[PDB]
Amino acid sequence: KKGSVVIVGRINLSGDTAYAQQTRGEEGCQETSQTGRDKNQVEGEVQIVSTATQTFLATSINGVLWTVYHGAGTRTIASPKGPVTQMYTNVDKDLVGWQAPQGSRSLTPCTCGSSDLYLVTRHADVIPVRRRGDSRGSLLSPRPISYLKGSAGGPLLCPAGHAVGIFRAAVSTRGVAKAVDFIPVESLETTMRSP
Amino acid sequence: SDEEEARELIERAKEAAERAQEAAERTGDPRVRELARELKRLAQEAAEEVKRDPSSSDVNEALKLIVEAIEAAVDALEAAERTGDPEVRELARELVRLAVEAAEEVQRNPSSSDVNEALHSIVYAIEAAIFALEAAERTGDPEVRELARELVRLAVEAAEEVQRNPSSRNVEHALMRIVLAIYLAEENLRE
Numbered sequence: 001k002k003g004s005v006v007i008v009g010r011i012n013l014s015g016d017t018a019y020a021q022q023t024r025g026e027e028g029c030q031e032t033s034q035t036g037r038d039k040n041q042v043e044g045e046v047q048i049v050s051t052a053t054q055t056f057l058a059t060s061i062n063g064v065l066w067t068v069y070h071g072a073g074t075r076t077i078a079s080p081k082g083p084v085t086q087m088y089t090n091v092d093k094d095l096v097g098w099q100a101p102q103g104s105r106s107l108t109p110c111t112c113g114s115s116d117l118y119l120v121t122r123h124a125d126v127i128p129v130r131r132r133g134d135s136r137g138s139l140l141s142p143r144p145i146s147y148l149k150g151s152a153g154g155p156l157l158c159p160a161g162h163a164v165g166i167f168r169a170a171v172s173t174r175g176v177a178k179a180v181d182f183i184p185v186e187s188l189e190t191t192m193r194s195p
Numbered sequence: 196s197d198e199e200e201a202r203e204l205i206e207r208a209k210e211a212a213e214r215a216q217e218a219a220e221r222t223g224d225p226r227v228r229e230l231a232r233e234l235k236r237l238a239q240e241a242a243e244e245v246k247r248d249p250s251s252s253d254v255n256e257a258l259k260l261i262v263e264a265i266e267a268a269v270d271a272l273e274a275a276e277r278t279g280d281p282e283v284r285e286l287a288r289e290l291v292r293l294a295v296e297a298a299e300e301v302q303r304n305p306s307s308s309d310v311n312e313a314l315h316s317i318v319y320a321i322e323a324a325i326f327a328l329e330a331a332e333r334t335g336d337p338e339v340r341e342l343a344r345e346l347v348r349l350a351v352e353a354a355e356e357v358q359r360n361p362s363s364r365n366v367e368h369a370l371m372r373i374v375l376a377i378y379l380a381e382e383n384l385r386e
């Protein structure tokens with residue numbers, strides 16, 4: 001009954017700033033979700049992803065495509081070889097991951113320790129974030145939540161374009177966000193093997 | 196940049212002080228008034244302690260947390276005011292009360308990591324509570340209300356145990372679990 005998560009677009013980060021593309025319309029999405037079979041070529045570091053009710057982001061880091069649990073649940077992802085099961089599922093971190101699809105490229109984890117972060121939205125906006133702690137960053141100006149909604153699973157990048165984390169939640173009062181919560185890149189826990 | 200950050204913190208403290216004052220007046224409750232007055236008091240004492248040490252990079256981070264605490268506590272107070280259920284209201288007020296106590300402890304002992312952690316945990320809890328209370332009011336839904344109650348009760352329980360024994364383990368996973376449940380409940384109502 002529950003379908004696969006479907007790639008409906010992508011965001012390219014290797015150009016000067018972000019560039020988003022739509023690769024699938026509403027109709028193709030629902031059929032692909034049912035079969036779990038998607039033969040489209042995948043490219044880029046950030047995928048735009050859909051369930052029947054929500055659209056959000058997924059970011060490739062260390063050969064894994066990561067997103068938020070609160071979007072994907074336990075769903076498989078549609079792939080050229082049919083539905084692919086999650087490799088990682090951690091509800092306590094709001095985190096899931098599938099093996100990065102053939103043709104995607106991973107972001108490199110940040111090693112520079114910079115506090116000047118940039119949050120990439122689904123529409124390829126780039127929002128500055130000042131890192132505060134492990135998993136929190138301040139916005140430079142208060143932001144209505146509607147500009148952030150649908151961008152969970154997306155990257156926070158350092159000035160060099162390395163991954164610092166995955167966007168998870170907006171710290172907000174009455175529809176106005178002042179800060180963001182992200183899964184730090186150090187928390188993207190992988191294992192050498194799987195049963 | 197340098198002393199520009201100290202002035203910025205004073206201005207946040209004064210706005211936090213004003214918002215606290217506005218909450219003290221707006222409410223027809225002596226229990227809220229006194230909490231709001233205490234928050235204003237801590238805001239003004241934070242603003243004054245920055246003015247004593249304006250070019251001091253060291254102690255200005257413990258006072259940054261106090262100003263953050265106050266801002267969040269005022270948000271929690273405003274959300275409590277718009278909450279229909281008196282049980283939830285009472286629980287929200289108790290969390291704000293515990294925040295006031297933890298802020299006073301930080302101000303009296305700014306270099307202690309135990310005292311700073313306790314305040315941080317309460318602020319974390321308050322942000323979760325604000326999401327929960329606001330979801331309860333937006334939806335008017337009984338299940339979202341009971342989840343919001345569970346969250347605030349948990350937050351109060353944790354802060355009171357951490358008062359007794361500083362070591363006492365954190366409820367961050369347990370709070371986020373309810374946030375998710377609230378979120379999914381709200382999403383199911385859209386349908």
Ligand SMILES: CC(C)(C)OC(=O)N[C@H]1CCCCC/C=C\[C@@H]2C[C@@]2(C(=O)NS(=O)(=O)C2CC2)NC(=O)[C@@H]2C[C@@H](OC(=O)n3cc4cccc(F)c4c3)CN2C1=O
Nearest residue numbers: 056070071094148149150151152168169170323371375378
């Ligand atoms: C944490 C705190 C301070 C209490 O605040 C908030 O809970 N705030 C809210 C504000 C909601 C308004 C929209 C804000 C706009 C954009 C938000 C990024 C976004 C999103 O775009 N989702 S989505 O539409 O793409 C969606 C399709 C993918 N996330 C959300 O809505 C998430 C989901 C839900 O959070 C969680 O279930 N958990 C489970 C966790 C486990 C561990 C740690 C965590 F932190 C966890 C957070 C509430 N969320 C918030 O953000």
Ligand SMILES: [Zn+2]
Nearest residue numbers: 110112158162
């Ligand atoms: Zn970096």
